[PDB]
Ligand binder design. Structure first.
Ligand SMILES: CCCCCCCCCCO[C@@H]1O[C@H](CO)[C@@H](O[C@H]2O[C@H](CO)[C@@H](O)[C@H](O)[C@H]2O)[C@H](O)[C@H]1O
Ligand SMILES: CCCCCCCCCCO[C@@H]1O[C@H](CO)[C@@H](O[C@H]2O[C@H](CO)[C@@H](O)[C@H](O)[C@H]2O)[C@H](O)[C@H]1O
Ligand SMILES: CCCCCCCCCCO[C@@H]1O[C@H](CO)[C@@H](O[C@H]2O[C@H](CO)[C@@H](O)[C@H](O)[C@H]2O)[C@H](O)[C@H]1O
Ligand SMILES: N[C@@H](CC(=O)O)C(=O)O
Ligand SMILES: N[C@@H](CC(=O)O)C(=O)O
Ligand SMILES: N[C@@H](CC(=O)O)C(=O)O
Ligand code: NA
Ligand code: NA
Ligand code: NA
Ligand code: NA
Ligand code: NA
Ligand code: NA
Ligand code: NA
Ligand code: NA
Ligand code: NA
Lengths: 427, 427, 426
C-alpha cells in the first residue's frame, strides 16, 4: 500500500481523505468511540499539523525578504492600500451575510432563557495603540522565536527594501554582499516551498485524521437549536464565496470556478487544521505554483491576510451574536445590529490565526451590544452553547478566512499585472 | 503643515524637537494636561524607540563579526586593554565630579529627616563570578532572542576571528565558504546601517514626544531640594563632558568641539531614550558615518561600552548618595566618600543600558556606605524622593553614558590609527 | 606563566588534568576543604562547560545541513536503520552487564531496611505518542533558542535533503541561490569545528577543575555499601567497553586500541562534564579530525546517539535497581530482571543528555518492578542513597554513553564505506 497510496492522483486524494475522515468521524460519534479516534487517529492529524507549523516562520520570513526586494517600495505601498481596501470591504460584507442568514434561520429562538436589563460592568477597552506599536518588533530574533507573524512581516519588508537600495549603490563590494544575503533568503525560501510539497503527500492522512477526530467529538452535538446555528453558519460562508468572491473575481476578470479549483488545498487544510497561520505555507504555495501570483505580492498579502482578514470569523460572530440575543429574549434592535458590523470586523481583525481564537473574540462583540459575560448569567449560558460546537464552526470559518486571502491576492495581483496568465488557460 | 517639515534642513532638525518638546512638555504638565501628553503625544516617541530597538541585535551581531574579521586578535586584544583602561579611568573621574558638585550644591540639606544609627541587613548573597561567567553564552541563539548584548559580543568576536583563519586556508572550498558567510554578515550589517539612517529622518518627531512626555510628568517635581539635586547632577554631567572628555580628546589631538558636533544624534537619542542599548544603532552609525572609526574598533568598544562604561550613572550615584546621606543627617565621612568612588564605578558597570537601572543599582552604593533601604526607614524615604525625579536625571546621565563610549572609541581608534583623519578637516 | 602552558602538546595534557585533578580533589575531601574547591577552583571548570555549550546548536545545525545534503536520502535511511539496531542492541547488552556485574558485587545486601509491601503510586503514566510528535518542531527558531537538539536534527536533515534536490534543477538562479545557502552553513560548521579546537586548549584546566570538585564533594561518600555500587558500575562500564564494544569493534575490522586512543578527548570530556549533549562538539570533532568519519554520518548518528543511545546509563540503572531491591530485603525475581532490560533500555532512551538525568529516570525503572517512591518509605530511602553518590556514577556512565555513540558511528561508517583509512593505517 505504498504504491497504492502514492500513485493515485493527489487532487482527489486529499479530498477522499476529508470525506472518508468525516464519515468515519460521524460513525464513531453516534456509536460512542470518539476516545479511540482521539488516541489512534488524531495523532496522525497532529503530526500533519506540526509539519506545517514548522514551515511558517522560515517561509514567511524568506519569501517576504525576497519579494519585498523584487518590487519598488512605491508599488508595495500601492499593493498595501489595495489589499486593505479589499480586506475591510469583504469583511464588512461577511458580517452582513452573517446577520441576514441568522435572521432567516431564526437562530436560538427555541432556547427560551430569561434575562433582565443587563448588569452594569465597566468596559475594558481593550486598547488599540499598543496593538499597532507591537507590529514593530523590538527584537526580531525574539519575534522569530515567539512565532509572531505581523512583526516579522514588518522586519522582513524593511530588510528586503534595504537590500535592494544597497545593490544599486556604486561600490562593487556592497553589491556582492547584499546579493549574497538575498541569495541566502532565496535559497531558504526555495527550500521551504519544496518541503511544503513533500508534506502535502501525507496530507490525506492528516486531513482524514483531523476531520475524523473533530467529527467524532462534536458530531453528536449538532442536534437542537445548535443544529440551526451550524446550518446557518455554513450557509452564510457559502454565500461569501459564491456571491462576494465570485462576483468580485468575475468583475475583475478571474474565472471564479478556476480560482476555487486551484485554491482547494489551501481550503481543505484550512478546514481541518482550523488555523490560518498554520495553513499559511499551503496558501502561499498555491499562490505561487497554482494561481501564478508573483512572490512580490503573495509574500506580503497572504501572511498579513492570515491575521487581519477573516471573513469567516467575522461572519461566524455575526450569526452567533443574534443567537445569544435571541436565546435570552433580548433580540438585537436594528441600530444594535449595525454596531455589530463595526465591532465584528474589529474582532475578526484581532483574532489569531489559530484554532478557537474567534469564539473568544466573540465576547468583545457581545459586550458591544450590551450583552455581558457575567457568570452565571443567561448571556454567559448561551455563550457556552456556542462553544460546544466551536470546532464544527471553526473548520468552516478558517476555510473562508484563508480563501478570502487568496481571492484578494489573485484579484490584487491581476490589477498589478503580477499574475501569470499561462496558469489560467484551459487547453 | 506637513509640507514644510522635509524641505527644512535635517542637519539640526533633531535638536528643535528636543527644545520644543522640552518646552511643550513643561507647559502642558504645569497646566494639568500632563495626562493629555501621555495619551496623544507619547506613542510617536514609543514608535521611535521600537524602531531603534529592533536593530540592536542585528547590527551588533553583524558589525562585530565583520569587524573582528577585519582586525588582528593581537590588536583587538590591545584595543580591549586600552578601552577598558580608559573606561574605568573616566568613570572614576565621574564619581569624583559627582561628590564635588554634590558637595558644592549642598544637596539635601533642607530635608531634615533625622534617622538613627543604622541596621544590619543584606539579606541575600551577591555574586560577581557568575556575572563574568555569564559573558560566555550557553546558547547564542537564545542570547540573541533575549537581547543580551555582552554574550553576543563574545560569540561574534569568536566567529569573526574564526572566519579569517578559514579564509587564509590552503583549500579553495573552505576559503569560498568562509568568504560567503562573511558576506552575509557584511550584507546584513550594511542593511542595518541604511535603516538607521532612514529612521533618523523620523527622529525629530520621536525626540519631541519623548522629552515632551518626561517634562510633562516630572517637570512639576523639580521644585524643592530635588531641584538642587537636578542642578547638581546636570552641572556635574556638563563638567564630565567639558573637562574630562575635552581634555582627554585634546590631549590626544581630536578637536573637542567637532567631536560633540558629530556625536549629537547619539547624544540626543541617549538623552531622550534613556537607554544606551536602544541608542546603540544611532551611536554606531555616528561612529561609522561621522567620526570615521573603523568597524574593527567601534563594533567592539561601543556595544561593550553601552553596558560597562557609564560615567553618567557613576556621577549620578555620587551626587545622590550625598543627597541621601545629608537628608538623614548622617553625612559621609571622607573615607566613606571615597568608598562611593569604588562602589559607584562597580554599580555603574553593572547597571543595564535600559531606562531606570541606575536608580536600582543606587541601592548597592548606599548599602556600601552603611545606608540601608529597610522600610520605612528614613534612608528608604530619601531614596524615594530621588526616584521621583528619576526620568529628568536619567535623560542627562544616559547622554553622558554613550558620549564617553564615543570619546573612548575615537581616542582608542586614533592611538591604533583606525581613525580616518579626512573627516575632521573642512573642505 | 601562561606562555609555558599553552605551548605544551595536547595528547596527554587532558589526561594530566584528569589524573592530577581527580587526585587533588580526593585530598580536600578527607581534609574538609571541599567548600574552598567549590569556591576557588570550580568556576574554571564551569567556564569550560559554558564554552562547549555555546557550540552545540551551531555545530549540530550547520554540520547536519552540510552532511545531510552530501548523502542521498536513500542511503541516509539505511544509516538510520543500522545505527538504531546497534543502539537498541548495545543498550540491552549494557543492561545485561549491569545485572551481571551488579549481582557479582552483591549490591546493597547489607543495608537491611523494612520495607514491607509498598503502597502504590498509579501515576504518572508514561507518554510516548506525544514524546514522538514533539520531535517535529513547530518553530525551528524556537527549537534553536530553546536548545532542543532532537527537533533541530529533524529540521536540519529535511533542509539538507531539500538543498541537494535544488542544486540539481535547471534554472541557474535556483542552483545558484541553493549553492549560496549551502556555503553559509558550510562556512559556519567549519568555523565551529575550528573554535572547538581552541577550546580544547583550555580543556585540561577545565577537566582538572570539574573532576576536582566532584572528587571533593562525593569522594568522602564512597565508604559504604555505596562503595560496592561505585565498584560495580565502574566494573560494568569497563566490561561494556572492553567486552561489548571491543568485540563489536573487532568483528567489523577496527583496531579497538586505536579507537580508545582517538576517542579519549570525548571520553574524558563526557566523564568530567557529565553531559552527553554538552560534550557533542568534542565528540563530533574527534569524529571528524581523528576518526576520519564523513560529516554525512557522524553529523546524524552522534547528535541522535547523544540522546537515545546511552549504554552507561542503561547499565547504571541495571546496577541500582538491584541495589534498591536488595536493600529492602525484596531481591528481584528473575522475571523482574527481564522487565528491567526492556524498561531500562526505554528509560535510558528517554534520559536527557544533561547531568543527573539518569537518577531521575531511575524512578521509572523502579516503578515498573513494584518498587515505588512513596515518601518516606524504605524504597525512597535507598533511592536517596543512590542519589548521594550520583556524580561519581554520572562521570563514568556519561563516558560510556558517549563512547558507545562513537563506536556505533565508526562501525556504521565502515559498513557504508565512509571511513578514511589513512588515519588508521600504521
Ligand atoms: C509520515 C509522513 C512523512 C512525510 C513524507 C513525505 C514524502 C514526500 C515524497 C514526495 O515528495 C514530493 O513529491 C513531488 C513529486 O511528485 C515533488 O514535486 C512537487 O514540487 C515541484 C515544485 O516545482 C512541482 O513541480 C511538483 O508538481 C510538485 O508535485 C516534490 O518536490 C517532492 O518533494
Ligand atoms: C512606520 C514607518 C515610519 C518611519 C519613517 C522612515 C522614513 C525613511 C525615509 C528615508 O529617507 C532617506 O534614507 C537614507 C538612509 O540611508 C538617508 O540617507 C542617509 O544615509 C545614507 C547612507 O547611510 C547616505 O547616502 C545619505 O547621504 C545619508 O543622508 C536620507 O537622509 C533619508 O532622507
Ligand atoms: C590558560 C589556557 C588559555 C587557552 C586560550 C584558548 C586557546 C586558543 C588558541 C587556539 O589554538 C589552536 O587553535 C586551532 C584551531 O583554531 C587548533 O588546531 C587544530 O584544530 C583545527 C581544527 O580542529 C585544525 O584545522 C588544525 O589543523 C589543528 O592543528 C589547535 O589545536 C589549537 O591549539
Ligand atoms: N481558527 C481561525 C480563527 C478563529 O477561531 O476565528 C483561523 O485560524 O483563522
Ligand atoms: N539609563 C541607564 C544607563 C544607560 O541607559 O546608559 C541608567 O539607569 O543608569
Ligand atoms: N548525564 C548523563 C545522563 C544520565 O545521567 O544518565 C549523560 O549526559 O549522558
Ligand atoms: Na475581508
Ligand atoms: Na485570513
Ligand atoms: Na484575525
Ligand atoms: Na568611564
Ligand atoms: Na555607555
Ligand atoms: Na553598566
Ligand atoms: Na545502545
Ligand atoms: Na549517548
Ligand atoms: Na536518552
Amino acid at each position: 500500500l505504498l504504491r497504492r497510496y502514492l500513485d493515485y492522483p493527489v487532487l482527489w486524494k486529499i479530498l477522499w481523505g476529508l470525506v472518508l475522515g468525516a464519515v468515519f468521524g460521524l460513525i464513531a460519534g453516534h456509536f460512542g468511540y470518539a476516545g479511540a479516534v482521539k488516541t489512534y487517529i488524531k495523532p496522525f492529524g497532529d503530526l500533519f499539523v506540526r509539519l506545517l507549523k514548522m514551515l511558517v516562520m522560515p517561509i514567511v520570513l524568506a519569501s517576504l525578504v525576497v519579494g519585498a526586494a523584487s518590487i519598488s517600495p512605491a508599488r508595495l505601498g500601492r499593493v498595501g492600500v489595495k489589499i486593505v481596501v479589499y480586506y475591510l470591504a469583504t469583511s464588512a460584507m461577511a458580517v452582513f451575510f452573517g446577520l441576514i442568514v441568522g435572521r432567516l434561520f431564526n437562530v436560538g429562538a427555541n432556547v427560551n432563557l430569561g434575562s433582565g436589563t443587563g448588569k452594569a460592568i465597566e468596559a475594558q477597552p481593550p486598547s488599540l495603540v499598543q496593538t499597532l506599536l507591537n507590529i514593530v518588533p523590538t527584537n526580531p530574533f525574539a519575534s522569530l522565536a515567539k512565532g509572531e507573524v505581523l512583526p516579522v512581516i514588518f522586519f522582513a519588508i524593511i530588510l528586503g527594501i534595504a537590500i535592494t537600495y544597497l545593490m544599486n549603490r556604486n561600490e562593487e563590494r556592497v553589491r556582492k554582499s547584499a546579493e549574497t544575503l538575498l541569495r541566502v533568503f532565496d535559497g531558504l525560501a526555495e527550500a521551504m516551498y519544496l518541503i511544503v510539497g513533500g508534506v502535502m503527500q501525507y496530507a490525506p492522512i492528516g486531513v482524514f485524521a483531523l476531520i475524523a477526530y473533530v467529527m467524532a467529538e462534536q458530531g453528536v452535538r449538532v442536534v437542537g437549536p445548535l443544529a440551526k446555528v451550524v446550518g446557518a453558519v455554513y450557509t452564510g460562508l457559502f454565500l461569501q464565496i459564491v456571491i462576494t468572491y465570485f462576483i468580485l473575481l468575475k468583475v475583475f476578470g478571474i474565472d471564479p470556478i478556476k480560482f476555487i479549483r486551484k485554491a482547494k488545498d489551501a481550503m481543505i487544510t484550512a478546514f481541518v487544521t482550523r488555523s490560518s497561520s498554520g495553513t499559511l505555507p499551503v496558501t502561499m504555495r498555491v499562490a505561487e505554483e497554482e494561481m501564478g501570483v508573483d512572490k512580490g505580492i503573495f509574500s506580503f498579502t497572504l501572511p498579513l491576510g492570515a491575521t487581519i482578514n477573516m471573513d469567516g470569523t467575522a461572519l461566524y460572530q455575526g450569526v452567533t451574536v443574534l443567537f445569544v440575543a435571541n436565546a435570552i429574549g433580548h433580540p438585537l434592535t436594528l441600530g444594535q445590529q449595525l454596531v455589530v458590523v463595526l465591532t465584528a470586523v474589529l474582532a475578526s481583525i484581532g483574532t489569531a490565526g489559530v484554532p478557537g481564537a474567534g469564539a473568544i473574540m466573540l465576547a468583545m462583540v457581545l459586550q458591544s451590544v450590551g450583552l455581558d459575560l457575567t457568570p452565571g448569567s443567561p448571556v454567559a449560558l448561551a455563550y457556552a452553547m456556542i462553544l460546544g460546537i466551536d470546532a464544527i464552526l471553526d473548520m468552516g470559518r478558517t476555510m473562508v478566512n484563508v480563501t478570502g486571502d487568496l481571492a484578494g491576492t489573485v484579484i490584487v495581483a491581476k490589477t498589478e499585472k503580477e499574475l501569470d496568465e499561462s496558469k489560467w488557460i484551459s487547453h
